[PDB]
Design a protein around this ligand. Structure first.
Ligand SMILES: CCCCCCCCCCCCCC(=O)OC[C@@H](O)COP(=O)(O)OCC[N+](C)(C)C
Ligand SMILES: CCCCCCCCCCCCCC(=O)OC[C@@H](O)COP(=O)(O)OCC[N+](C)(C)C
Length: 90
């Protein structure tokens, strides 16, 4: 999957991952859309690598807030996410 596209889907989550109120509906929709598009193993792994690279470039990233996005947005994942998630097993 294209990192530019991934970036566009989650861009609305920025304010929240930086400590602001949220997650907004636009953030959740982007995440749901990404979840709906990254289906094959390659795409999940690709999307994972992308998000980890994007997250590492955010100043004052709040990992606690970023981690709670899936559960707060209603997207159930069989695991917890973090900056050190192994993308080869997602
Ligand atoms: C399905 C699982 C979902 C996982 C949740 C993902 C959480 C992370 C989402 C973050 C999205 C926001 C990223 C972004 O779009 O960047 C916004 C930028 O303004 C951040 O700054 P940079 O890209 O580093 O730009 C450089 C800024 N400078 C020039 C001031 C240093
Ligand atoms: C929090 C700090 C920021 C770092 C950002 C890293 C987060 C990376 C998140 C990657 C998410 C991968 C994309 C995705 O949406 O996939 C979700 C799946 O892994 C979960 O769906 P399931 O079908 O339950 O997957 C289980 C495997 N199956 C398909 C064989 C059943």
């Amino acid at each position: 999957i294209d990192c530019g596209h991934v970036d566009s889907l989650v861009r609305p989550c920025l304010s929240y991952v930086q400590g602001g109120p949220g997650p907004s509906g636009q953030c959740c929709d982007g995440v749901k859309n990404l979840h709906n598009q990254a289906r094959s193993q390659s795409d999940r792994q690709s999307a994972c690598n992308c998000l980890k690279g994007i997250a590492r470039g955010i100043h004052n990233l709040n990992e606690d807030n970023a981690r709670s996005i899936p559960p707060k947005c209603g997207v159930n994942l069989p695991y917890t996410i973090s900056l050190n998630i192994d993308c080869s097993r997602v």
